[PDB]
Symmetry: D2
Subunit: 213 residues, 4 copies
């Protein structure tokens, strides 16, 4: 009833990388039951971004994940009230990004309030030199911890001219009401930038996700 087959997305991200502020706004559409979403993002402050756009994309909602009937869906349960999440993104060269998303619902439209803060990316690293190609597909591991839901994922950015650049995601998901806590399960992800302009001031972003156990 609350979750519709076709829903809208509106977001604003405010943040900084290595002390340099930026802001991005986005509008999109998603199919919660099919685990598919797409959005168009516009850099409003800090452009052209002096860092790899890819570090931001997984911050731009696990309601857009196909959950089978036999797995408890923490996220679709949380609405209309919604949920928030916190995440640390620990890169292998010491770059660390912290992010949050507060997700509310206005009719058939999700509203995101996002904060993003990254520090200690080396000037000669693949992030500050914009040498990333894409995130590889992933499998997130989800488990309950002290009444809330945790999700951890080993992530990897493919690099221009070969190799990978690793990042460890640790997410905590917090429902704004009492919902059923799921057993240990997995979510397969695949995030892709389908189109962008020269300096990534405009980006079309897609994600597909499916839960399994």
């Amino acid at each position: 009833s609350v979750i519709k087959p076709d829903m809208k997305i509106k977001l604003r991200m405010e943040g900084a990388v290595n002390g340099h502020p930026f802001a991005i706004e986005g509008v999109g559409l998603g199919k919660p039951f099919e685990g598919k979403q797409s959005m168009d993002l516009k850099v409003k402050e800090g452009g052209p971004l002096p860092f790899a756009y890819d570090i931001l994309t997984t911050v731009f909602n696990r309601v857009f994940a196909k959950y089978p009937e036999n797995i408890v869906d923490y996220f679709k349960q949380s609405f209309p009230e919604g949920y928030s999440w916190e995440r640390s993104m620990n890169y292998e060269d010491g770059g660390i990004c912290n992010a949050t998303n507060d997700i509310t619902l206005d009719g058939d439209c999700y509203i995101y309030e996002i904060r993003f803060d990254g520090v200690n990316f080396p000037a000669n690293g693949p992030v500050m030199q914009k040498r990333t190609v894409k995130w590889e597909p992933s499998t997130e591991k989800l488990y309950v911890r002290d009444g809330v839901l945790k999700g951890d994922v080993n992530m990897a950015l493919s690099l221009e001219g070969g190799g990978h650049y690793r990042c460890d995601f640790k997410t905590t998901y917090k429902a704004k009401k009492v919902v059923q806590l799921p057993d240990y399960h997995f979510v397969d992800h695949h995030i892709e930038i389908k189109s962008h302009d020269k300096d990534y001031s405009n980006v079309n972003l897609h994600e597909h996700a499916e839960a399994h156990s």
Copy 2:
């Protein structure tokens, strides 16, 4: 030719946890092309083990993983010469286990020389209090780094009376000859202790693994 549908396993692990030495020997059988193996393990030194047996089980060979024709198989390529691996296992409460395996082939039998060293497990933690139930199934992420193969996995031990206890695996695999390096891929794992005696001096251990991309 070198890899047979039915192969044998013989291993010896020497190690220590929190400064207390132990040794385990095992014999087993595996189906390399089906990604299935099973073994019987006997504690030879340090028994009865004062720590959770589960911390050891993933140390007791990625040749026992079903690789599809479209994914380069680093491990089956490495034989008859074989390969070695190194691993750090970083637990959330500061317990750290380092492990190595040197894998050789004698006819149709793999021979493992294993070293295992764990430190800083709290006395009141789930490892030293033997409060673990099993490892959850997992998805390992494999990627090439500087001419060798890396494999990282987010692991979780289910606990007696609820909850999970997290560990981060970082493995480096090193072929003893020049082999083809694979593209980014995944291996699904499920390791299970099928039977054991009261103090885990005798353990029957099973693993199923399948690669995908």
Copy 3:
């Protein structure tokens, strides 16, 4: 010439902890050559703060450090233009705080623009439980990398009722102009909340710092 024996401080911090937004303003005075400073801090938004105030205090300027003749002073060199820093603060229970400070100089007064973002603090951890007493005195180790100055410190919070809580600091300092780079050295720190009200709405904060080789 621009560095005076007696100088003023004005600051604003905007931040969030576990997605809870807050803002703090500060006014103070410091003696750059004696490595002593003090300030009055006022919570302006997000009060009363639902976390241990001590996580913020080391974010509220290494210009206030007594540097001997034999060590190059990276920070006093940087003015009037000034410098900025970025820091990751990695707590032993997985809580991570990222912070930045952009420091400018207007007359005899330093102006700070501060951002603070902490995520994944466990509900039952000493930060969210407000169970910290003080930071123990510390020794920061400073070393050059990639033409900028790094500062790392092993930090510990004393806990109410006994025990300690560990945090590892990794700071990158960045002068806004080309300055002479120092060799490996140490800075001894002692930070103390001298007075506060019940909810820490008002805090008097003191720091003493001295460099040595």
Copy 4:
């Protein structure tokens, strides 16, 4: 009574780095009350060592630390029975070394049983490249947890041609009998290889340590 102004040291280390096995023996002498020691170390197996010798030196006894009257001496208290320690050494490029030392006393001579295991050192990192010069002087922070003594230290290796390489030490000290526990304190360390041959087959190693509050 059992602690004399002049005491002897005999040790054996068995270990591996990146799966390469080695063994080292040592004989030395130390002055427990002055916090000074020196020893001659001889590679017995696995020579010539294919890694930076400096990773081993802090593993080759806090009984050799000058303790003032106002601080409880955990280590001198523990004898004649003695104590053991465990340590994780986490390097910034992902190399991790675990080590243990079991220290006993026979007459005026300390006997060490040492285990050392390092994994995941990158082929192009300063350890496998043998590009380290020395450990910088350090300050260890010691604090009680769970009835045992913890010691943590932010460590840095000076690199040949310039720059530094960071490692975080986490040590747990365990007395074999019930002893008085100290409050939070510091131990200043200075470790130096005074002489060695080309392949480090023979090494003369010195350490000076002093506690302070």
